[PDB]
Chain A
């Protein structure tokens, strides 16, 4: 089974440079050409690079030509994407794909998991997590409020996944250079406000863990 695993990726200020690296698997790495495809959440998709079996022939579209550089190491079975002169149009998700032949054209069979690149210039800010409590029935939704984190990957866990049938994790909204979600969970009336429910918020970029427990009003 083909397993393409990307690596690298993170936060780069506009003007810096970063090198990504995909990793190959069981099937033969020299018989196929590889690529990089870009995922923005607004528009998608855009393909940016392709290098052949040997490192001789490379292909680029009109936009990223001159900025990006693709390479291979056929003994290590790895890709490399040398990105230089980054700007605000390069904050997106990057996949490594394997280009294969059809009868008349090309096609991408297997893609990787994808690493996230964020190119913007504020600082790495840890999140501030707030409880959400109502001011009576059988089904009562709870919630926490998370506001004040710039890096996009965040992980909210409700009691080590104990209440995972009714977890409604809400996506963040970019506003005032801050991403802001409001995580929620469906809790029966017997559990709350009688038992222990605490939202574990993990922020692996700044390596912080903020544990906040909803108190009754």
Chain B
């Protein structure tokens, strides 16, 4: 009956800059708590009533606000903070949480390592085929992948498998699966996935042939 809206949904951050997110309410709320959820685990003790830090948390996180607007401010960004931050009320019955703000580490721009694979021989006996395109180690996340299939663009049956940011190299990896039929697979010759990067002007074109090998 009362809704918490977090105004930044996805945020990028360089190590050593000021990071500020917001959890806005729809009426007057006395206190709003916070939780940190790293990928693969459960949320933890992060920020009780409004500005009260927990015990093991670093001493460079902040919280403020009253009434409607509430914020979580990071003084100096590090690499230990790539997680998701939820907010929570306790005023009325439903105890609605926030939508979630994903904070990910901003990195210098890198070119995608591109390889596209044919379906195997055992997949051909199953009456279908799925063209799989690997796109490894590229920043940013916002890429535009189209299937240049003999010059035409077909955005149907596209299964894009996105990963999380790895905690070592801080890169993004992508798959792109084109679900087709076996006789639909045997209609073309040129199979092209391309990578639209904001730094490289032309898309990186790596293709194979069906009649090859």
Contacts and interface: CB of A to CB of B under 8 A. Distances in A.
**Is A in direct contact with B (CB under 8 Å) within the complex?**
yes
B49 A105 contact: yes
A6 B209 CA distance: 51
A175 B179 contact: yes
Chain A CB count within 10 A is highest, among B30, B49, B120, B126, for: B120
Nearest to A47: B95
Interface in B170-213: 173, 175, 177, 179, 208-209, 212-213
B195 to A, nearest CB: 15
Contact of B117 (A61, A105, A132, A169): A132
A182 B113 contact: no
Interface band, chain A: 35 or more
A61 B93 CA distance: 7
Interface in B105-129: 113, 115, 117-120, 122-123, 126
B123 A130 contact: yes
A130 B122 contact: yes
B163 interface: yes
Contacts of B24: none
A174 to B, nearest CB: 10
A104 B95 CA distance: 15
Interface stretch (A23-31, A116-124, A134-142, A194-202): A134-142
Contacts of A134: 115, 117-118, 208
Nearest to B93: A61
A95 interface: yes
Nearest to B126: A128
Interface string A125-161: 0001011111100011101010100000000000000
A44 B86 contact: yes
A173 B49 contact: no
A181 interface: yes
A104 B213 contact: no
A143 B213 contact: no
Counting chain A CB atoms within 10 Å of each CB, the highest count among B94, B160, B177 belongs to: B177
B86 A145 contact: no
B137 to A, nearest CB: 9
B163 A171 contact: yes
A197 to B, nearest CB: 15
Interface string A26-63: 00000000000000000111110000000000000110
B48 interface: yes
A113 B42 contact: yes
Contact of A168 (B42, B117, B136, B209): B136
A37 to B, nearest CB: 9
Given A141-B136, A143-B117, A145-B123, A112 B42 contact: yes
B147 interface: no
B183 to A, nearest CB: 18
A42 B43 CA distance: 17
B130 A104 contact: no
A171 B161 CA distance: 6
Contacts of B120: 130-133, 145
7 contacts: A102-B49, A135-B209, A141-B113, A141-B134, A170-B161, A170-B163, A171-B162
Interface of A: 43-47, 61-62, 95, 102-114, 128, 130-135, 139-141, 143, 145, 147, 168-173, 175, 180-182, 184, 186, 217
Given A46-B97, A102-B49, 8 more contacts: A61-B93, A62-B93, A102-B31, A107-B33, A112-B42, A139-B113, A143-B132, A145-B119
